[PDB]
Amino acid sequence: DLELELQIELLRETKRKYESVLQLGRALTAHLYSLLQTQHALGDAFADLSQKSPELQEEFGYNAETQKLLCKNGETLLGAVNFFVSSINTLVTKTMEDTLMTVKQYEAARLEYDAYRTDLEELSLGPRDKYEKLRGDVAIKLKFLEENKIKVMHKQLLLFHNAVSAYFAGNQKQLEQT
Amino acid sequence: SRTVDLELELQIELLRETKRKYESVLQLGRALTAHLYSLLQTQHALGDAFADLSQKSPELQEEFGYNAETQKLLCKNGETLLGAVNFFVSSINTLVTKTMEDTLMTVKQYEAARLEYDAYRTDLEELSLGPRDAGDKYEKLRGDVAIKLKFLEENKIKVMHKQLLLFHNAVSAYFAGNQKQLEQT
Amino acid sequence: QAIKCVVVGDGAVGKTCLLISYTTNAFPGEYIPTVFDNYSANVMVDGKPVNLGLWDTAGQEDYDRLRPLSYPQTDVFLICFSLVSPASFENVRAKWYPEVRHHCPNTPIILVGTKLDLRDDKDTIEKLKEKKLTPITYPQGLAMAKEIGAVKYLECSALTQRGLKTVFDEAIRAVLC
Numbered sequence: 032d033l034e035l036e037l038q039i040e041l042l043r044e045t046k047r048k049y050e051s052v053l054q055l056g057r058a059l060t061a062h063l064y065s066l067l068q069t070q071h072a073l074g075d076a077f078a079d080l081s082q083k084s085p086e087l088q089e090e091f092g093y094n095a096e097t098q099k100l101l102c103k104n105g106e107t108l109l110g111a112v113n114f115f116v117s118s119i120n121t122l123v124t125k126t127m128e129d130t131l132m133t134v135k136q137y138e139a140a141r142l143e144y145d146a147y148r149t150d151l152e153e154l155s156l157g158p159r160d161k162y163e164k165l166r167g168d169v170a171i172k173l174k175f176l177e178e179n180k181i182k183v184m185h186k187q188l189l190l191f192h193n194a195v196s197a198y199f200a201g202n203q204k205q206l207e208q209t
Numbered sequence: 210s211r212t213v214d215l216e217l218e219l220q221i222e223l224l225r226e227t228k229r230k231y232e233s234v235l236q237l238g239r240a241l242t243a244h245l246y247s248l249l250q251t252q253h254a255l256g257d258a259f260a261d262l263s264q265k266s267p268e269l270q271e272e273f274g275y276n277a278e279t280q281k282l283l284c285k286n287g288e289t290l291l292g293a294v295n296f297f298v299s300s301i302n303t304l305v306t307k308t309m310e311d312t313l314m315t316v317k318q319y320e321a322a323r324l325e326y327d328a329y330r331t332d333l334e335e336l337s338l339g340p341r342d343a344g345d346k347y348e349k350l351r352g353d354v355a356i357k358l359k360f361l362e363e364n365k366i367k368v369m370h371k372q373l374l375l376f377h378n379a380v381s382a383y384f385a386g387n388q389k390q391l392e393q394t
Numbered sequence: 395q396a397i398k399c400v401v402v403g404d405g406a407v408g409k410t411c412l413l414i415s416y417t418t419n420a421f422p423g424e425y426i427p428t429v430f431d432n433y434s435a436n437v438m439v440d441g442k443p444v445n446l447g448l449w450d451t452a453g454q455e456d457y458d459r460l461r462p463l464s465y466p467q468t469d470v471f472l473i474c475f476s477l478v479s480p481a482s483f484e485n486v487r488a489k490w491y492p493e494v495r496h497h498c499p500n501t502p503i504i505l506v507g508t509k510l511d512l513r514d515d516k517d518t519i520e521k522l523k524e525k526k527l528t529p530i531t532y533p534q535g536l537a538m539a540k541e542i543g544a545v546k547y548l549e550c551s552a553l554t555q556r557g558l559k560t561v562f563d564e565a566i567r568a569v570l571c
């Protein structure tokens with residue numbers, strides 16, 4: 032049957048891309064985390080130099096505050112990015128699997144009906160029904176997840192974007208509070 | 210029985226402690242450059258993926274594309290940041306690595322002369338205590354480091370002032386032109 | 395001391411595996427670890443404590459704009475090419491040699507032969523001929539180095555480590571001369 036296996040083949044290409052996204056996701060997390068460690072250390076290094084270098088007190092001064100504010104805001108952003116990737120993960124590691132698994136059960140009793148047909152076909156003219164039950168839990172299971180995809184990606188994609196945006200706004204704001 | 214050039218030696222300790230701290234900043238800067246280059250690239254990938262998914266998903270065409278364009282705006286703006294930090298790192302690297310090293314090269318010669326003079330005048334003392342007898346390099350070097358320490362401090366203020374000003378500006382300009390369009394695309 | 399070494403070269407050559415194998419002693423073929431990550435290392439170059447800063451890159455044209463962003467303040471380039479890829483090897487003069495010089499014309503360059511194992515194996519050896527092509531020899535790689543101005547020319551396998559540990563010792567020596 033075409034319907035399902037056109038619906039499945041797409042549920043994989045999609046499980047894939049969302050993985051390729053999930054990759055770039057932890058990466059973003061990674062690089063972001065590091066960058067924060069650096070800005071934290073850099074703000075302390077600048078605060079210190081500010082106290083010791085009266086000739087360059089202001090210059091080291093505004094540089095430390097900035098880096099400190101940036102680090103603080105970066106924390107929230109990181110939280111967000113994590114919640115993102117995390118949730119996108121739940122939608123791939125579990126919810127999607129739960130569906131991709133019942134497909135395996137469907138595939139188990141799938142080509143065995145299409146095989147046993149052509150197979151026990153030779154044997155004829157010479158001189159066992161719950162195959163669809165899985166079909167229910169794979170069509171009703173399948174696009175019952177698509178709604179779920181939409182519901183999650185919509186929300187997740189919005190939080191993420193808002194988070195990134197908020198990042199720069201929160202930064203640009205307090206950054207002008209000097 | 211030890212020669213001490215109080216003011217001078219205090220300045221030397223400060224230069225060594227300054228050089229230590231700057232070298233620390235220099236390391237952090239380098240890390241900052243790495244991570245920023247790593248962050249950058251991702252944003253280029255993310256941008257492309259999101260742009261991809263945006264076309265292969267009409268249900269979420271506006272959501273994915275909204276992000277695609279942002280992760281693409283950032284990247285470009287984070288190219289101007291990277292360039293600025295490299296500039297920061299290499300400028301201060303010249304100061305520490307070359308200009309401060311030149312002076313410390315003279316600070317070491319002077320310290321050596323100062324210690325030789327102390328050993329010399331000490332040898333003289335424990336030599337008087339015997340069959341009886343009770344009747345330049347250091348000074349030239351002492352003068353050479355003072356001049357250098359002064360030239361160095363002058364140049365240090367200038368280089369750091371300019372670099373602290375530009376680094377700060379670059380770091381914040383990575384928000385100004387990053388806001389007026391971060392969600393205006 | 396701080397030395398910055400950038401690894402460049404046609405994608406698929408193994409620049410990423412070259413650096414993960416070296417710095418972590420493991421092949422990344424397992425999940426392909428953190429994208430666009432850079433790597434550092436601490437090696438003893440003759441009773442000498444060195445902090446090696448290794449920069450990975452992306453060979454695809456898509457990144458031609460933000461790639462040279464890592465070249466400033468570099469100390470030694472390692473133009474790579476696959477010994478199993480004659481095509482990649484051509485771009486050694488077609489793309490890399492110029493670009494690296496276009497920005498920093500004065501920095502030492504080390505030509506490396508990534509994948510020295512798939513040079514005598516039963517598979518690509520056949521499909522290589524299948525495309526009317528053959529693997530890169532010592533010459534024309536040894537001459538390629540000279541055709542450019544490489545301070546050295548080594549070969550190695552990120553999957554066997556043979557010649558790996560060396561490639562960087564040469565990168566460093568090329569620096570402090």
Ligand SMILES: Nc1nc2c(ncn2[C@@H]2O[C@H](COP(=O)(O)OP(=O)(O)O)[C@@H](O)[C@H]2O)c(=O)[nH]1
Nearest residue numbers: 405406407408409410411423509512551552553
């Ligand atoms: N057999 C073999 N394969 C390698 C070697 N190095 C990389 N590869 C493979 O080549 C492909 C691309 O390698 P990669 O490190 O991602 O190349 P990059 O574009 O330079 O980062 C992957 O499928 C690797 O498993 C090698 O030393 N020997």
Ligand SMILES: [Mg+2]
Nearest residue numbers: 409410411451
């Ligand atoms: Mg790679």
